[PDB]
Symmetry: C4
Amino acid sequence: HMNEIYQKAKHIKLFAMDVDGILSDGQIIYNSEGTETKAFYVQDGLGLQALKQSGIILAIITGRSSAMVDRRAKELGISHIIQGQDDKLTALVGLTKKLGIELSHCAYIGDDLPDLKAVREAGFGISVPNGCEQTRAVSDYITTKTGGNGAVREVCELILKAQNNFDAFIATFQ
Amino acid sequence: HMNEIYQKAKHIKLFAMDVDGILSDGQIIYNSEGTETKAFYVQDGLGLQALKQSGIILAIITGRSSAMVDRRAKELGISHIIQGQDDKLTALVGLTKKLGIELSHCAYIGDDLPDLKAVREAGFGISVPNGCEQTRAVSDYITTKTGGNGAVREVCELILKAQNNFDAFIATFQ
Amino acid sequence: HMNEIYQKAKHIKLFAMDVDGILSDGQIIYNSEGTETKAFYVQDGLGLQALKQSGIILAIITGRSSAMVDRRAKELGISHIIQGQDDKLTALVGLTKKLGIELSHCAYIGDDLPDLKAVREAGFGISVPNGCEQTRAVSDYITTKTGGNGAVREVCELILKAQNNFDAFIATFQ
Amino acid sequence: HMNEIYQKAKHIKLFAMDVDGILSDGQIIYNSEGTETKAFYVQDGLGLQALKQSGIILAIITGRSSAMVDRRAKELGISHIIQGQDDKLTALVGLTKKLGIELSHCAYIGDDLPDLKAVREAGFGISVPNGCEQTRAVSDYITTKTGGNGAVREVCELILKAQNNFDAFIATFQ
Ligand SMILES: O=C(O)[C@@]1(O)C[C@@H](O)[C@@H](O)[C@@H]([C@H](O)CO)O1
Ligand SMILES: O=C(O)[C@@]1(O)C[C@@H](O)[C@@H](O)[C@@H]([C@H](O)CO)O1
Ligand SMILES: O=C(O)[C@@]1(O)C[C@@H](O)[C@@H](O)[C@@H]([C@H](O)CO)O1
Ligand SMILES: O=C(O)[C@@]1(O)C[C@@H](O)[C@@H](O)[C@@H]([C@H](O)CO)O1
Ligand SMILES: [Mg+2]
Ligand SMILES: [Mg+2]
Ligand SMILES: [Mg+2]
Ligand SMILES: [Mg+2]
Ligand SMILES: [Mg+2]
Ligand SMILES: [Mg+2]
Ligand SMILES: [Mg+2]
């Protein structure tokens, strides 16, 4: 039952995300001119702005590093962009310190092994259906939609509903 | 039963479309050289020309903005291209005024929250299986095929059949 | 039962293909620098070389036109490349005349309305699961695998088996 | 039962991979500027580093040839990169000789006909669900996940478990 999850999302002040496998579907794409490509999902962007609008801080913590991530983050107002960092919990804890925020007030979503401890230790830990078993085992919630296909949108809506901000947001479009 | 839907599509003079999640599958794609990519579906193009051929005006109303949209629109003869606009109903109403057309004569298709009011208020409102629930709740029809996979083709065929123009079009290929 | 289909593929001398929706999955892809992209399937290439090796002539007949098609055709030895042509039967008949070949000796595969007559009139006509109903209605065979996912590979294997050339080809890899 | 497979992976010293259809999902992608694209999977990379970390040598043997393969191989420490080579067994045997290693100590994964003999003859032979039947017929194991979607990750985990290295690796993330 969902109230158990709303209980966890209730006091989130910060939402941090892994990129590959969460914000994208995990494809790493190269071309013959040395150029790299990453694909994001349009409904995730709108869900992230909703969350962000309700006064939640958005962050990226990713093991890889690219201009694509920076660009996607900039247009959605994901305001703390940590790249080239696979020690996710350490990075999260570091953010917690510079914002004056507790881990219990952090939500984190990841698909693989570097994310497991951040997923486990955050107030609200999320993984995805194609997440590795070990990270899923340790999460508070597993999305229905998959990474780069509205897993993020889904969690945004969930946090909004827990904080009584979803229905009002919806209403602005009706 | 389908006649209920044909009753609604019967008097459409204008078909307006959201892009992301409707004409594409919702992927937003960036590369390391700062270049953006969007993917469309080939069967949608042919369905749009069929509609267009039968004397329906084609329009795009999209929250984002790109040369890809302009190019795709130009080759199919989507003749009114409104980009960087998320207030879809306002944009639709504006078109209705410059063409001398009523909303009841507009069909509109969208996948997410900015489209809900245009979907609700148009004579024929359409969403897609991966559309947000709120927009689907308010639509006259939900396509079987998904966005960027022939949702548009499907609605083109539907409007054509309602206007007794489909079978004749087909016949030109037989 | 399959022998009915082998009876039709038995005397094929030429295999002609539509591109979009057959050799690709139907995605039409543009980027912000004005560049177009198309995706093909690796197993189709090998199946086409097998067919080609057994002495069947390979041709493309496509409504659109691009350097991608030319390049893909060149590496597989698809030797007649007709682009910017939607009148597929006329184009096929034209090929039949310059090679001294009958239509009954042509196999053709297509997904949409411009292909229906070529599919109907060729000795062996093929469509795909996501083909429009009208073209599927008129085909001798509908592949199990979808376009850009081994529909072509599948038909190559089928023609090879009808001509007693498949098992031998396989054997060269064992 | 899985122990039968662990018995085969038990003594692997080298893991060799086909690229197209294994490391990618088989898409061959061209653009209008003459540029080629290939997509890899993020979870495969991490599984390959795990394997590699446990002291297994990683190799690529692919029929095609591109800078994308070289780049992907370089970042994961796939250390022997054989491209433009479809005679996979010969290439594998050649590697076996320059490293002083037996075939029984080689694991190989491939999706199509050029890989069948390497798959058959290696100590541990793997194919994928969308592999051609002939190669699947001759393999010791068929992955559950498909190519470019974690088939490789899956086999990495399997070899690790057979060599009692998986649980320990996992533990470093807990
Ligand atoms: O993914 C996006 O960029 C996003 O979802 C953000 C929204 O604010 C909005 O601009 C939306 C468009 O309506 C989609 O066309 O795109
Ligand atoms: O998507 C297209 O551009 C379209 O469907 C439009 C049609 O008019 C026709 O040109 C078609 C081609 O037959 C597809 O190869 O492409
Ligand atoms: O799609 C290809 O280019 C093809 O299937 C053609 C084959 O001849 C062969 O070169 C094959 C490679 O073995 C795939 O890596 O690619
Ligand atoms: O595919 C990758 O490059 C890989 O899986 C390799 C890992 O070592 C790690 O860097 C991982 C990132 O954590 C994914 O963001 O990427
Ligand atoms: Mg990840
Ligand atoms: Mg691409
Ligand atoms: Mg793609
Ligand atoms: Mg949209
Ligand atoms: Mg086609
Ligand atoms: Mg691209
Ligand atoms: Mg292969």
